[PDB]
């Protein structure tokens, strides 16, 4: 209904946005390692539907 | 270029019922206002109703009761169900964006009722 900002930070640089975010109860980010390295570190968003 | 399309109206003999409606398409800001409006040959844009985001229903005397407006978040249109009509209501309609900036309009619906 409102517009709305959006401010991530994954491993590799920064992710800022202004749009219609449809927003759920509890946005969030699933974060993994990987089975070799565990260096850097996988993010899926769950943050908006659209 | 936003984009307002009416469909719906037409010749109904006193006592029909039709559904209008205008879908906005385009930029249309998020907190829209959109609204209905009158006018027969030789008078002025008569206010029949308006509606905001708030889901909140304004209507005019004029036609008491007899109008509703319908909501639709997911394609975000509007459509007037127009029942009980009589020939007072013969009059093209507009809709009216208000969007946050620019105000549309549309570009009219004949709706006539007589017997």
């Known amino acids: 209904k409102t517009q709305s900002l959006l401010i991530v930070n994954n491993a590799t640089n920064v992710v800022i946005k202004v749009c219609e975010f449809q927003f759920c109860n509890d946005p969030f980010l699933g974060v993994y390692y990987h089975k070799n390295n565990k260096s850097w570190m996988e993010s899926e968003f769950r943050v908006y539907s659209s | 270029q936003v984009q307002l399309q009416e469909s719906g109206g037409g010749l109904v003999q006193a006592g029909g019922s039709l559904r209008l409606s205008c879908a906005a398409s385009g930029s249309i800001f998020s907190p829209n206002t959109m609204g209905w409006f009158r006018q027969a040959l030789g008078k002025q844009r008569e206010m029949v109703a308006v509606?905001?985001?708030?889901?909140?229903?304004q209507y005019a005397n004029f036609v008491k009761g007899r109008f509703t407006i319908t909501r639709d978040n997911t394609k975000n249109t509007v459509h007037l169900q127009m029942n009980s009509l009589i020939p007072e209501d013969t009059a093209v309609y507009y809709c009216?964006?208000?969007?946050?900036?620019?105000?549309?309009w549309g570009q009219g619906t004949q709706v006539t009722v007589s017997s």
């Open positions: 509606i905001s985001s708030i889901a909140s229903t």
């Open positions: 009216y964006a208000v969007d946050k900036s620019q105000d549309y």
